[PDB]
Ligand binder design. Sequence first.
Ligand code: ADP
Ligand code: ADP
Ligand code: ADP
Ligand code: ADP
Ligand code: ADP
Ligand code: MG
Ligand code: MG
Ligand code: MG
Ligand code: MG
Ligand code: MG
Lengths: 370, 370, 370, 370, 370
Amino acid sequence: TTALVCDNGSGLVKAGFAGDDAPRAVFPSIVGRPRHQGVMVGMGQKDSYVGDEAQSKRGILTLKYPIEHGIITNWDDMEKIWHHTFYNELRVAPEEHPTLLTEAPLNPKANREKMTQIMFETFNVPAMYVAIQAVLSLYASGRTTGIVLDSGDGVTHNVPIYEGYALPHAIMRLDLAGRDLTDYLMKILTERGYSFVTTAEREIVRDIKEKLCYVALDFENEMATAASSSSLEKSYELPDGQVITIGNERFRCPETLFQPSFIGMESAGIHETTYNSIMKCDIDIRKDLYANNVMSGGTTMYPGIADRMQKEITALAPSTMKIKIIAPPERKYSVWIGGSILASLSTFQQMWITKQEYDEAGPSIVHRKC
Amino acid sequence: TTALVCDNGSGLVKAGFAGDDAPRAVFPSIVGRPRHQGVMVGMGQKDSYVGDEAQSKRGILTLKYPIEHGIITNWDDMEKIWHHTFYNELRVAPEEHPTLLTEAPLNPKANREKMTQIMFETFNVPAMYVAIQAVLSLYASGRTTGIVLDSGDGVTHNVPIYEGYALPHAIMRLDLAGRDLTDYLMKILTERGYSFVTTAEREIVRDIKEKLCYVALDFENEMATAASSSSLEKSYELPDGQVITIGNERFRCPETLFQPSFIGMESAGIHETTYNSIMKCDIDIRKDLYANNVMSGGTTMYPGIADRMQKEITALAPSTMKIKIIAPPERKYSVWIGGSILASLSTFQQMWITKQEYDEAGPSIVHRKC
Amino acid sequence: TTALVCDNGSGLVKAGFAGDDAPRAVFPSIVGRPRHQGVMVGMGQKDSYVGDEAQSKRGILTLKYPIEHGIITNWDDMEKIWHHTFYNELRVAPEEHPTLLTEAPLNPKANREKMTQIMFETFNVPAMYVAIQAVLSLYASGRTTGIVLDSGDGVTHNVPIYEGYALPHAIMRLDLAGRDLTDYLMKILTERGYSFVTTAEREIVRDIKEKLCYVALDFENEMATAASSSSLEKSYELPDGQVITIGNERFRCPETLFQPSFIGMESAGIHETTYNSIMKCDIDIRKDLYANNVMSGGTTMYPGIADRMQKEITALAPSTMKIKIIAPPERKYSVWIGGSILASLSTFQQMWITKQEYDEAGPSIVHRKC
Amino acid sequence: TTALVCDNGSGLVKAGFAGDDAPRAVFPSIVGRPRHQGVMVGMGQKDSYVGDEAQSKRGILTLKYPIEHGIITNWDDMEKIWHHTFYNELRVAPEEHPTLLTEAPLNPKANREKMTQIMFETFNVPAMYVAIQAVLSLYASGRTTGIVLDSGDGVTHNVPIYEGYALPHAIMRLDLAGRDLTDYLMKILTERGYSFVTTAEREIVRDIKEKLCYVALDFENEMATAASSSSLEKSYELPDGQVITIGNERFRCPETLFQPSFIGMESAGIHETTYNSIMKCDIDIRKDLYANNVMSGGTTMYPGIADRMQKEITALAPSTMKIKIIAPPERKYSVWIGGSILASLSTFQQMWITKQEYDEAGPSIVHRKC
Amino acid sequence: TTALVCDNGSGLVKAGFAGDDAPRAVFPSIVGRPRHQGVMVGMGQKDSYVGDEAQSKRGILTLKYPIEHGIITNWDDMEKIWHHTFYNELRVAPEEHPTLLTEAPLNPKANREKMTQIMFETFNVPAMYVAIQAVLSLYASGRTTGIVLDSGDGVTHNVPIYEGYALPHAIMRLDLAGRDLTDYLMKILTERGYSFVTTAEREIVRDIKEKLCYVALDFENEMATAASSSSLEKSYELPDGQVITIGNERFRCPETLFQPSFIGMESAGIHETTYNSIMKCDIDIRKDLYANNVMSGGTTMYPGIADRMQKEITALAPSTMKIKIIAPPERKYSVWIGGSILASLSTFQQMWITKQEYDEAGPSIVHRKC
Ligand SMILES: Nc1ncnc2c1ncn2[C@@H]1O[C@H](COP(=O)(O)OP(=O)(O)O)[C@@H](O)[C@H]1O
Ligand SMILES: Nc1ncnc2c1ncn2[C@@H]1O[C@H](COP(=O)(O)OP(=O)(O)O)[C@@H](O)[C@H]1O
Ligand SMILES: Nc1ncnc2c1ncn2[C@@H]1O[C@H](COP(=O)(O)OP(=O)(O)O)[C@@H](O)[C@H]1O
Ligand SMILES: Nc1ncnc2c1ncn2[C@@H]1O[C@H](COP(=O)(O)OP(=O)(O)O)[C@@H](O)[C@H]1O
Ligand SMILES: Nc1ncnc2c1ncn2[C@@H]1O[C@H](COP(=O)(O)OP(=O)(O)O)[C@@H](O)[C@H]1O
Ligand SMILES: [Mg+2]
Ligand SMILES: [Mg+2]
Ligand SMILES: [Mg+2]
Ligand SMILES: [Mg+2]
Ligand SMILES: [Mg+2]
């Protein structure tokens, strides 16, 4: 039996089989529930859709992300998303496959415990392991030395690792990801006239963010550039036909990451959380962690940040240490690639949580086995 | 025990049997009472002629539609029309058949209640189920994604259905139909010299509108084209012998549908209530509601309406969207065809409002069962 | 050079000068020809007597109204009547005076066009303006908010006006006026034993009606009262010398106005056309349209109509509403008084249809200038 | 001279003089354009009435609010409304008075820009300041620690303010106000039969809502109470005369505010947007934002709002937190009262936007000066 | 001239007059500045609140401790805290009283130099003296022989003293105090669900630690106890209103002090730094320093450490030596009590650094006078 690696994140579930380098199931993890009066007899109107189905039939559905800020808020639907992923998208009875879930660091223990309990008492997988959603990024990037920076529709990490030796006192978790970027974009668009309120329109705002937003390289100059028109404005055609021209509010949606005094948070940007994470590391380590800031996650796929993070940190690091921002052009999947790599290594077969061990020690065995 | 489907509109009562695709009884719903003095010791002149009887004997009678503007204002003759439809055209036993009445949306609740009470206390049918006259149009056209326009002689109402799920918050009932067009025609004919005042002549005006009126593809240019004489004139030979030539006032009788400012109605034409009923729907829905503008009812059988409708909508829809008016040539009975289809569904035979339920919980069961 | 105004009704043609409150010329618009054989070489035997000249010699002539039911059915005699009105009572030079014709609403456009053609090719008046016969009544009453009611020698029309904005969708024309009341009186008189068949007989019947008919305030009470002989009889003396006593049929003749079933007509009485015209108007209008039921024409001079109409309307109006029928004593000429008023206004002099405009644009200018 | 405070809302223009506590001119902000055919050459027919004039002459005009959902959609008539409310209402040259307009939060920048450009290049006022419509509500209620709910006829927005420091990241704009309540009422009346369609009838429906509609204290209980007849029935007498008995549909018109699932809107009621606006504030601030829920705007003058609101909030707030709702009896004008107070303060006397600054930098000054 | 004794720690400033036994001014040393958007004109919103004034209005402020790890990091705000203490909390003039500051041992010399330079060139006090924060603890305890252990919110340092002769080669300093304990509690709390990030919530975390944390006696036994739930759990009530059950992590927050391998530090616990400080003394001293382990500072006020530090030391010290932990109940204010005892002494009255000596010797006179 081959090992199943499902990067169950807070945005779109990225699941697939081990060994490969591309997940087979990439669908937004939303559970849609109809809200309008349904009047048609012969139709098989399913009472709750999930995934790309509930993404394409939006105009009837009240979408509901079952994971808010990395943690699982609503279980009864995340169970349905796992059901869909296992059966209707991969077609593999989970009783005959190991499982490799993931979990952002610094999350409640109830989350991980109940994830294990569900995966063992509803799907009865033979073995399940949950790795940190940011160590697999290094396992994929091939290194064993770099301050990872996860992101994307959920939380944001900074997990320094010197030589496969994570420093659990310098993981600077921050919940300022694409979801808050979207809830700020759909609030700055209003200043122009376009009003998106529902969830089916929040998805349109997220698509605008995806294929139209870039990170400035000097915000206080891009602003003054946006005074007299330029190549800033770029029309986008909503799924009903009308267009939108967003000139100013396209390098302010992802620049919240570097200035969180916009959406109201206090904690500094993702350029200063990395620096504080490094300054929480030893002196014989900083001088080399400065040289590989391996990125990850969706949110870090802007045509900006991959090259402004370097300037922001060079304005903070000593002028001698060499700064490098490893920006793999596949970082959107680096976490699952790392999961699939780690699940293949033979040295890892001792790491699974066999069903016998869970049965003998209850669900609270993960806190020691992972 | 087969089901009975009778779309008792404001004009022609269209009754028949389920499964089949042609209404058995298609006759106008009028109840005439003789007004003159009958002096004949043998002629058994019954005090009321109903339907085609009163349509054939018009010079002696006082025709009176029982259904005015969708609602029922005179019950003691609609009851007689139902009795006639059952016992003289279908020649059936009502207590041995389920009934499927219809009703335009946004009608008073008292109308539904008294309708079901009559059906359960004057014919004692085992189970009757009413339905919105728009859903049956999609049932007939074999769709689930349309925006209906059923406008038969009493009302007009665009009910947008996306995928089996009606959007009750964005329907546009309009109180202007073939009857108001007939009134406007018998009022615009006096402009030329032909005087029709009585009801037996109003029926002649309606028969003029039916066959000699058409919708101008460009009304403000047709008004100038028909100024200088052309092939615009026609000639309808009245049942008296004298012929009349309705030159210009034949694309002005159906142009009220698009400019209701003619008969004083402040509301918008049937081309703009559709656009508003769409722009009240969701953005992820407008794209494929713009594509299926299923038309129903009689008044939408003018020669040039399925084209001017598309023109007027394209004049105000987003320029990158595809518009298409699904106009099946057999639309005049499309409501009843959809009714016969719906009563012939396996999953539908539970929706009936059985006589047991009415005797158990009173006539107000319909408001919650339909 | 002042202007002229001739309310060319179907009966008495009222003509005069713009500014005075008295039509100089009043005479029945009857044109008659001798029908017997005349053998008197010396006597000045005319060829065709018109107006009062023909009214005063009936036993020899055969009278002919050119304006039947409001429309001009005969042109080569209405032209004679206009010529007589201009060259025997007013004696004016039509080339030196503008004329203000009148017309009832909802009349064929042939009347308008041929009236303009006659006035601009047979009298060469500088400027003619034809106005509706109800707006003039409101002018004469000096109001701006009333529901007019004009009737005489065959026409009846309620034109509701709120503040100069005449509602063109709520006018209620009706051919149930003095001419038809006379035709019913000369047919009910044959019941008692008096025979009137010819046109001189019709004139005698009209003179009977004008001074011996009144509108009953309670039809059934009156029929039950006059069934037992009382003081209801009123002896009239024909010019022959025979005396007749029209006991009962002196309120049954003007009762057709409120029960048009007598002449077989189907349309409602004038007490109900008014209420239907009001219920065709808007809700913010009805409240103060009920309070001005301004009447006009001759047939509204029956000694009991200004109160029976109020009773009948109050019977079917909202109970908390005020119905103040404005029936001034000088209503028989209200149309022409309003004509003289609105022709003597400062800002009206631009409204005329000058001869230049007709010469440059044809006789079809009325349909746009009126 | 003295400053002008004109709370140009989406309903009634509530304008007046600063320092006082009563707006001199409250009148609905509608622009009526007559639609019927106006034929009376005597009247001085003003072609565009505006305000209470166009509210008194409704049966003739086409009422058209120039502000749809807080934003100004039609400028060319809002300019006329400003012209009227200055000259024909307050009789003051605008060039000799400072102006204090208001504007709901989260509105397009174009709105403020064009508002300032009009106020400076059409009336040439010496100085104009525009402030958010909730800060003024706090100024009026005296506090500096509240979470406003100013919701009148077009918008609804909770602006939490802890100590003079607004939290811009926690405003909840919602377009579910009086206008949508009125539309839902004129759509729900059709349950019984009363059919209001035109704008002169939309005004009647609004006048029904604002005096016979109350908010239930337990909606599911009141629905069942209304089954068996009780004091729920109330009679309103239309301006036409006929009365209507709105039995059940009088606590369903304002219950939309707490279940916007009725108009199909997805966003939760105004009882949950307040709670979300608070749960977006800080932990030590919620303690005394839960205690001052200052209410404002028209739509919060229903009888049973200030109690069902508190019930709903205590139903989802911590059981040890004190929930108060400051509902001042003069809350209809509280925004204008706050405006007058604010313009009557020395520390604000320097915060105007003088004509000099606008002339020197253009209309784009407001974005930074307000 | 009476002596002013202000003990500027890194937590709560404890100032007051000499002679007494309780500081008159105890308030957290935090300079807060607003971070939100102030929208008010009347309010006097000061730009930087300092002290417990900046603790009531905590939801608006970015609290910034001006003393990080004993040393003074930011000076422009520490000057403000001194300003507040001297004027708005004691109402004394600085040039009217001798000042007695303090300083933890082994701190940068620039710190003390600029402290004196401020006290003499900004406040211009007559005479100022700065003494170590442990010999004052000994004065307060009334001895001249003891291994002081001062540990409050910042640094932790042992200063062994045999008989008035401090041994400056055994002052084991370690920065693992209350501030690091709070930054570790707000990180161990995340594992349970409660997420505190901002400084305003970090103060709530510190207030949790203050009145809910206790030191275990056998850490492993307590951990094994917390597995099978016991009465360990307590419910603290945030100012939000909700309650938190911190079961396990209430003896893991103050057990970092004895196992610094939790925050990743390497230096031994405070139970072993005292032992190494003693073993750095002489043989004829240890046998008596083992008996006077005078505690001090805030963080030594747990319901734990005393009866646990005694055990941990007896597990290290030789058997026949006698270990006694002098733990007075006022050890929170021990440093200031000792300062007030010292400043009121005769012999000490020659130790002051008068303004005279500082002038003709520079700010570097402290390095010989202290
Ligand atoms: N091409 C892109 N450019 C910028 N942002 C993107 C892009 N694609 C996705 N995103 C953002 O990143 C998120 C996906 O992050 P991802 O790492 O897949 O989440 P998860 O960790 O839950 O799988 C999306 O919600 C979107 O907001
Ligand atoms: N061939 C036709 N062309 C144009 N209009 C027609 C035609 N046939 C019927 N109509 C109009 O349609 C009306 C009948 O519509 P219908 O759908 O039967 O009404 P209902 O829904 O009340 O049954 C008639 O009153 C007539 O005005
Ligand atoms: N005193 C009267 N009482 C009753 N009816 C009268 C009286 N005088 C005239 N009439 C009726 O009024 C009619 C005259 O109306 P007329 O003024 O010609 O109408 P119009 O204004 O359309 O020309 C006559 O035919 C006659 O029947
Ligand atoms: N007495 C009342 N009771 C209930 N609702 C009212 C009352 N008066 C007004 N309203 C509603 O409030 C609206 C007026 O709100 P208002 O705050 O004046 O609007 P604006 O903010 O534009 O001035 C009206 O449209 C009406 O629907
Ligand atoms: N009752 C208490 N229980 C436990 N810890 C406390 C208590 N009171 C204060 N503390 C801790 O001690 C610190 C105060 O120590 P203190 O000696 O006053 O600091 P400083 O040396 O800066 O004056 C606080 O930050 C808090 O973490
Ligand atoms: Mg993640
Ligand atoms: Mg129909
Ligand atoms: Mg007339
Ligand atoms: Mg407002
Ligand atoms: Mg201390």
